[PDB]
Design a protein around this ligand. Structure first.
Ligand SMILES: Nc1ncnc2c1ncn2[C@@H]1O[C@H](COP(=O)(O)OP(=O)(O)O)[C@@H](O)[C@H]1O
Lengths: 211, 550, 155, 78
RNA sequence: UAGUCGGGUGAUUAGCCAGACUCUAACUUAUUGAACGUAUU
């Protein structure tokens, strides 16, 4: 997960009012660009590439109808019940597969940085960060369980094989610390870091590249 | 009426042309000659038209294949639809998902075509009223709808098999008339003038049965053409029938003077290539065979020309198919000395008889031999009979096959039989690695039978890694989860990242366990030591940066 | 016909009400439930709605023909009760039928068309004028106006 | 253990990654036309985020960095 | 690439030419009856 920065709210959301208007009344052609310009086509919880995506609510409308037409609750996750399937990752598994979960026990990528709650390993599995005690550790565990980050094979295997595809590069970068100057090595690391944004999984590669 | 049927038939419709032909033939001989008519020629051209493509394979003008299959309240499916491919369709899923059920339904549908080809208005197989209907159900009946394609003149042949459960007042009927009509066209045209007939075969789990040629099997003269439709959809190919037919072919080939003088002449003109070099001991009982060739001159002069036996061509075609598809088998023939008739093959350079084959080389050979026999017998007007059209159902194609064999079974089958529509189920990523993504129909792992209209996977399986196919398509870990040694690398990751990325007592103990278990040259230890090297110097660089950052 | 139309009045009303909400237009030629929409992936749930509504209204007496449920798009052929819908979103007779009519008119041009086929061609041309008025103009241009006038006759 | 290749030898598309690796190794490292066309057909066949495309991208990364190191070594002295 | 749409040529249901489309995805059907078109009227 990434720290997502919000922008100006689209005006089409303020046109309708929660309760009187249903979610199906809006057109998604206006919220998708707004989600994309801040997410870049990556999964609000899984860094899944948005080939089959849908608008996701952090708080489901069944038990929180008042949080319907608010851009804070809006997120772009993978999967689509409209296109059918058995999706078990990001938003779809949050709403259906997990069940019986508390909203405040899930980290929000909007205001809360997921870096200090989640750690991504070389093996490809995500674990809570070292030193998490009390509500932080439980919150990270609940996030992992609800979003099925450690779970369905199509995510664990894909992330693992994406991280293991760059490990020779990481070894070759870090093994020549004495050969390169501090400034040259730092700028080369910056060049490597700035262009993994085009890659699929942001933080797993970032965790495999950064300190 | 005649005018409407003529308008439709001149446009390319086959049913209208056959109707016109029948109404002309059953009338007075002024317009009915049973043939040499415009409509009969139209029908036979529609069936027989084709062209050799750029690769040398005969491609019929009007291909025959199954388009859609609908399963309503059939076994575990409340309502399911499939979009069978024109050339190859692969059905994958866990155990108890319905792949065998789909193949069983397709075979039951094809049984009506087979029966009405063999026998006018014949009765095919029917759905079981005891097991086939869904246990839960809502109406206590099941439907199996199929649509077939036979060219632009016959774009749809809808056939539906229906059955009601035991103790139900209202019984549902089957709509099998269009299949009867198409098979009537095939049978009538074939009897008037020989045509190439389609092949319908089912190879289910009932194959791989032990032994071969159990009984003399007085069953109807394997030599005759319509013996290729006998037990063709039973699940287990009649390999005893193939062996009897092969011995029949060998007897016909070696019992013809014209078909024996050719080998006598060649055999005589082989010792000259050998006895001239030396070996004066290979002529005493071998130049005597030259006298046999001389005797063949007086045993002949009745054929003079031709002398090309059809049975010999069939035998050669079947032998070539068997040797090309089966990897281990290099040759196959029949021995008459030791005067029980027995068939011998050559496995890995060793001449072995048919009964000492293993399970995996005998089962695959049985399938290939039965299919080749049926293709040869049903396609007498083709230069390569294996290029005929038909539908073949194979269940668990990787049965008893080593992973080396699974890498080439699909390619060999598609090369030997290019016009056959193969519908296949499998549990293997190795076979899927040789199959295009578009040809795979997968079952969702969390499915209870309410899913409809199966879909192809997302990841391109053809040419992909087997481990990747296991990860993304088979929904299975590449590393077992129930083994404690599998999580050792992740545990090392945790115990290494805990302090600063450096080793300590428990991390060193875990590293020693990994080294002792997996070994020195194992990739697990290589990953562990690369991880250690990366983390130690990452920590060093972090300390270096933090020194100047204060 | 009228009894059949009345017996489906409630089904037609409920199906139309359900379809208008999801931007789907519904028509029925007494045996052909036609649903069309410009929204993708919206027609998938229509058959289930039809089955549940039929069970609610007529019980087990009226059932859908599952083998006759067809999904079509602009990538494939689109015809409603005998009229082809073009990729230009206009009504048509189909290219094959138009070529058949052209061949019939060509046969009439050289006097190789008998009285039965001539009457059939006149009926087909009247049906085409009802369905595709531009086809009549195209045939007038291709086969001259006087030939067409003599073929259709005069009052 | 079983002496079976991960990718099927009888499929032409299974040798594209190794061919790309060789055609990038023999060259100076820059994506010439010969490497570019093979990379493009690999992308078209396997997909945008297939393992093959990620491996090819990683090979490009490591070859570019190795070329950079060689250039730095050459610039250091003669 | 298929497949589909169909403007033109074509003694014309075929062949060809130009253009275009792609929800996992048409398969052209039934009278004398009903309604529609057309003709007598
Ligand atoms: N009449 C039935 N009603 C409900 N479920 C059934 C019925 N018959 C079989 N099944 C179930 O459906 C599955 C049928 O297995 P099968 O078709 O052989 O699948 P596969 O080849 O994938 O293992 C099993 O899980 C079985 O329990």
């Amino acid at each position: 997960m990434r720290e997502l920065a919000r922008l100006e709210r689209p005006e089409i959301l303020d046109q309708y009012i929660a309760g009187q208007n249903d979610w199906m009344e809006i057109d998604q052609s206006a919220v998708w660009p707004k989600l994309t310009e801040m997410q870049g086509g990556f999964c609000a919880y899984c860094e899944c590439r948005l080939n089959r995506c849908h608008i996701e609510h952090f708080r489901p409308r069944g038990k929180f109808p008042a949080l319907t037409f608010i851009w804070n609750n809006l997120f772009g996750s993978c999967g689509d019940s409209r296109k059918s399937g058995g999706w078990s990752r990001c938003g779809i598994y949050k709403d259906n597969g997990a069940g019986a979960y508390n909203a405040d026990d899930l980290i929000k990528p909007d205001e809360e940085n997921p870096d200090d709650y989640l750690l991504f390993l070389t093996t490809g599995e995500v674990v809570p960060a070292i030193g998490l005690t009390g509500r932080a550790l439980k919150k990270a565990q609940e996030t992992i369980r609800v979003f099925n980050l450690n779970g369905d094979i199509k995510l664990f295997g894909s992330r693992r094989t994406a991280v293991q595809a760059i490990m020779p590069n990481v070894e070759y970068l870090y093994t020549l610390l004495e050969e390169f100057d501090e400034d040259d090595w730092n700028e080369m690391l910056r060049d490597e870091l700035e262009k993994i944004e085009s890659d699929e999984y942001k933080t797993a590669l970032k965790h495999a590249w950064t300190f | 009426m005649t005018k409407q049927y003529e308008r439709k038939a001149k446009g390319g419709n086959l049913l209208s042309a056959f109707e016109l032909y029948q109404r002309n033939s059953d009338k007075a001989p002024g317009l009915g000659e049973m043939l040499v008519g415009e409509w009969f020629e139209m029908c036979r051209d529609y069936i027989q038209d084709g062209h050799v493509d750029e690769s040398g394979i005969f491609r019929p003008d009007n291909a025959f294949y199954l388009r859609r299959l609908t399963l309503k309240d059939f076994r575990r499916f409340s309502l399911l639809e499939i979009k069978l491919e024109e050339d190859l369709t692969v059905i994958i899923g866990n155990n108890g998902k319905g792949k065998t059920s789909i193949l069983y339904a397709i075979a039951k549908t094809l049984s009506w075509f087979v029966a009405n080809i063999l026998k006018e208005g014949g009765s095919g197989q029917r759905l079981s009223e005891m097991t086939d209907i869904k246990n839960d159900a809502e109406d206590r009946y099941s439907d199996v709808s199929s649509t077939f394609f036979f060219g632009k003149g016959l774009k749809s042949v809808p056939i539906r098999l229906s059955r009601s459960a035991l103790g139900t007042a209202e019984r549902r009927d089957s709509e099998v008339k269009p299949a009867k009509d198409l098979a009537d066209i095939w049978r009538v045209i074939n009897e008037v003038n020989t045509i190439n007939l389609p092949t319908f075969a089912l190879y289910n789990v009932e194959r791989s049965q032990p032994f071969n040629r159990n009984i003399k099997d007085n069953t109807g003269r394997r030599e005759e053409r319509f013996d290729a439709y006998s037990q063709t959809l039973g699940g287990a190919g009649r390999f005893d029938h193939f062996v009897e037919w092969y011995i029949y072919l060998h007897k016909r080939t070696v019992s013809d003077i014209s078909s024996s003088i050719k080998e006598l002449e060649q055999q005589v003109n082989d010792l000259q290539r050998t006895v001239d070099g030396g070996m004066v001991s290979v002529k005493s009982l071998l130049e005597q065979m030259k006298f046999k060739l001389s005797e063949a001159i007086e045993r002949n002069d009745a054929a003079v020309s031709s002398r090309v036996l059809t049975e010999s061509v069939q035998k050669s075609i079947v032998e070539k198919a068997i040797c090309s598809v089966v990897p281990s088998i290099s040759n196959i023939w029949v021995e008459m000395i030791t005067g029980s008739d027995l068939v011998k093959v050559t496995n890995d350079g060793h001449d072995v008889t048919i009964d000492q084959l293993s399970d995996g080389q005998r089962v695959f050979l049985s399938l290939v031999a039965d299919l080749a026999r049926r293709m040869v017998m049903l396609n007498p007007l083709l230069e390569n009979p294996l290029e005929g059209r038909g539908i073949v159902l194979i269940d668990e194609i990787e049965l008893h096959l080593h992973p080396k064999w699974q890498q080439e079974v699909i390619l060999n089958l598609r090369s030997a039989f290019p016009n056959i529509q193969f519908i296949i189920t499998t549990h293997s990523p190795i076979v899927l690695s040789t199959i295009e993504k578009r040809c795979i129909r997968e079952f969702e792992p969390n499915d209870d039978g309410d899913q409809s209209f199966l879909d192809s996977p997302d990841m391109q399986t053809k040419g992909s890694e087997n481990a990747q196919i296991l990860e993304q398509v088979m929904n299975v870990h590449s590393t077992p989860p129930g083994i404690a040694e599998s999580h050792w690398l992740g545990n090392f990751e945790l115990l290494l990242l805990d302090n600063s990325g450096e080793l300590d007592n428990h991390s060193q103990v875990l590293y020693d366990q990994i080294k002792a278990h997996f070994g020195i040259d194992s990739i697990e230890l290589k990953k562990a030591d690369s991880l250690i090297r990366i983390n130690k110097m990452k920590n060093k660089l972090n300390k270096i940066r933090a020194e100047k950052g204060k | 016909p009228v009894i059949s139309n009345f017996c489906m009045y409630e089904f037609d009303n409920r199906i139309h009400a359900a379809c208008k909400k999801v931007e789907i237009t519904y028509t029925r030629y007494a045996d052909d439930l036609t649903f069309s929409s410009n929204i993708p992936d919206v027609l998938k749930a229509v058959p289930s709605t039809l089955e549940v509504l039929l069970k609610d209204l007529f019980g087990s007496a009226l059932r859908l023909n599952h083998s006759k449920t067809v999904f079509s798009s602009k990538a494939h052929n689109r015809h409603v009760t005998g009229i082809t819908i073009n990729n230009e979103e206009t009504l048509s007779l189909g290219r094959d039928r138009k070529r058949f009519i052209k061949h019939l008119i060509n046969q009439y041009k050289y006097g190789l068309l008998d009285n039965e086929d001539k009457a059939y061609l006149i009926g087909l041309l009247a049906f085409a004028s009802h369905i595709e008025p531009s086809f009549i103009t195209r045939m007038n241009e291709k086969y001259s106006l006087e030939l067409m006038e003599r073929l259709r006759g005069q009052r």
